[PDB]
Amino acid sequence: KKARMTVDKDYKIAEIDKRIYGSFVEHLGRAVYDGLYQPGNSKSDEDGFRKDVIELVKELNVPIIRYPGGNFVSNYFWEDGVGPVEDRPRRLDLAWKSIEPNQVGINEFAKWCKKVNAEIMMAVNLGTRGISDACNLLEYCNHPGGSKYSDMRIKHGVKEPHNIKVWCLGNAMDGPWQVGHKTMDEYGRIAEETARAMKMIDPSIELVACGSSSKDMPTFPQWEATVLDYAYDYVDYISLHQYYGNKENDTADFLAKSDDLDDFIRSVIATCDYIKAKKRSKKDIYLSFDEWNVWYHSNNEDANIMQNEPWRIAPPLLEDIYTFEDALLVGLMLITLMKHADRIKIACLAQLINVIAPIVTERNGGAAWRQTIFYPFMHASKYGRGIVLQPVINSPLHDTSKHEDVTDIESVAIYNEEKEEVTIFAVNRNIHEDIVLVSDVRGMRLLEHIVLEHQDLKIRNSVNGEEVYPKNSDKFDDGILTSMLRRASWNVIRIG
C-alpha cells in the first residue's frame, strides 16, 4: 500500500552524461532502406531522408547514434559506401542474409545525423579486417586534409572532417553466429593494437572495447577482464548488451528483469575495478551500454524470412510491435541505467528505426508512427538531464515465478540545478495493486505529474494511433510529495 522514499540534494550518485540517451542504427532490415532513407518519397527531403522520421528522432532527442553495426560491421568494407554512387558495389551481408546496395554510407549517414542533431559513434570492422583499415577510416573521417584518405573525403564532397569522437572496436565477436569470431585473447590483442594505432592519428577520440554478446555467454565476464587486461591504457569504455523478452507470458516476472540488469551492470563494474587494481591505474573504465531493448515479438517471423527468401534487399527483419508492458520494462531499464550514471556514460537503445524500434515507418513507403516504448525514452531523455540522486527507498516487495523480493516501486530522482527542477521517475510493477509513494524531498512546488498507463498490458500502437501516449494528469504540501501510482505505470513527477 505505502512506499517511502527520501530525496536529498546533498546525495549525488553522478552527473548524467547525455550520451546515455543514445541510440543505434544498423544496416539491417528496413532501418536504412525503406526506413530513414527513402529517395523517391513525397515525405523526403532532397537527400532522400524522410522528414517525418527526422522530426520523430529530434523528438526523442538522441545525442549519439551507433553506426553501422552491429553484426554487419564484422564483414563490412567502408570503401563500398563512399565515392560516386554509381561505382558503389552491392555486397552480401552474411550477418542478415541480405544484399547491401551501399547507397547509404558514412557520408550519407553523417548528414542525416546533422539533421537529427546527433553525433556518430562509428564501429570499425574487426571481424574480417584489422588495424590499417581502421586507421584508413579514422583518417578519412577525422583528418583535415593533405593525405591519401582525408583528401579522398574532400573529393567525395565533404570538405570538413566529420570529427567522430567515439569509436567502437568491432562488434561483439564471442558468438558462433558472427563472421570473424574471435577468442578473448585474439580480440584483446587486436583491440589493443587497433586502439594504439588510432590514438596516434587522433588523440582526442574515445574508444569502446567490446564486451560479451550477452551475460549468458559462458566466457562472460572473462572476456571483459581479458580484453581490458590487454587494452586498458588505450580504451575508454567496455560495452554491455542486453535484451529481454516475454515469451513465457509472465508480466510480473517480465517486469522484474531490470533487477537482472542491475546485477549485470554491477558485475561489469566489478570486472573493470578488478583490472584497474591489477594495472595500478588511476583511470576508471566507463560503461557503454551500446545495445539495450525489449526484443522477442518478431522471432518466429524472422525465422521464416530466412531461409525462405535469402539475399533480399531491405527485408522486414526484427520488426517487433511493442506492447504496453514492453514500455514499462524499457522505463525500468532507463531507471536502472540512470542509477549507474557514475559509470555508464554512453547507452544505445537498439535500434532507432523500424528494427526493434520506437519509430516505425509502414512499408513501401510510409506512414510513420511511435511505438509504446517511444515515450518512456522521450521522458527520460528530456527530463533526465542533471544530477542523479541516491535512491534511498523502502518499497513493498513481491515474489514472481523466477525472482524473489522484487521491489514494487523502482524510482530515481534527478536534480537539474541550473533550472531549479527535480524530476522523479517511478515505475510500479505491481500491476495489481495501486500504491502511494510518499517522497520526502529534504531540499526541497509541484509542476506536473506525467503518467503512462493502460488497462490492457498487451495493447499496442499502430499506424492508426497510439493507444499508449503520455497522459498529463493526477493525483505538494510542505517538504513532502505524496503520489498515488497506478498498478503498472510509468510516472514522471516534476517539482520546481
Ligand X SMILES: OC[C@@H]1O[C@@H](OC[C@@H]2O[C@@H](OC[C@@H]3O[C@@H](O)[C@H](O)[C@H]3O)[C@H](O)[C@H]2O)[C@H](O)[C@H]1O
State the residues that interact with ligand X by CB under 6 A: 26, 69-71, 171-172, 175, 177, 213, 291, 350-351
Task: Tell the smallest beta-carbon distance from residue 26 to ligand X (Å).
Answer: 5
Residue 197, CA distances (Å) to 131, 173, 193, 248 in order: 7, 21, 6, 47
Task: Tell the smallest beta-carbon distance from residue 241 to ligand X (Å).
Answer: 6
C-beta closer to ligand X: residue 242 or 372: 242
Task: Tell the smallest beta-carbon distance from residue 170 to ligand X (Å).
Answer: 10
C-beta closer to ligand X: residue 73 or 426: 73
Residue whose entry in the numeric block shows the C-alpha cell 542523479? 388
Task: Tell the smallest beta-carbon distance from residue 137 to ligand X (Å).
Answer: 19
Task: Tell the smallest beta-carbon distance from residue 347 to ligand X (Å).
Answer: 14
Q: How crowded is the C-beta side of 411, counted as CA atoms within 13 Å?
A: 29
With the C-alpha atoms ordered 321, 324, 328, 334, is the resulting torsion angle positive or negative?
Answer: positive
Supply 428's cell numbers. 510500479
Q: Give dist(CA 383, CA 492) in Å, integer.
A: 9
Task: Tell the smallest beta-carbon distance from residue 22 to ligand X (Å).
Answer: 14
C-beta closer to ligand X: residue 207 or 413: 207
Supply 332's cell numbers. 525500468
What is the enclosing helix (H) or strand (E) of 230? helix 222-231
C-beta closer to ligand X: residue 213 or 361: 213
Decide: residue 433, CB within 10 A, 0-12 exposed, 13-18 middle, 19+ buried. Answer: middle
C-beta closer to ligand X: residue 177 or 203: 177
Residue whose entry in the numeric block shows the C-alpha cell 533550472? 419
CA-wise closest residue to 209 among 95, 286, 297, 119: 286
Query: Would you say 457 and 323 are in contact if contact means Cβ atoms under 8 Å apart?
Result: yes
Cis link prior to 351 (omega < 30° from 0)? Answer: yes
C-beta closer to ligand X: residue 268 or 452: 268
Task: Tell the smallest beta-carbon distance from residue 176 to ligand X (Å).
Answer: 9
Buried b (16+ CB within 10 A) or exposed e, 319-353: bbebbbbbbbbbbbbbbbbbbbbbbbbbbbbbbbb
C-beta closer to ligand X: residue 67 or 425: 67
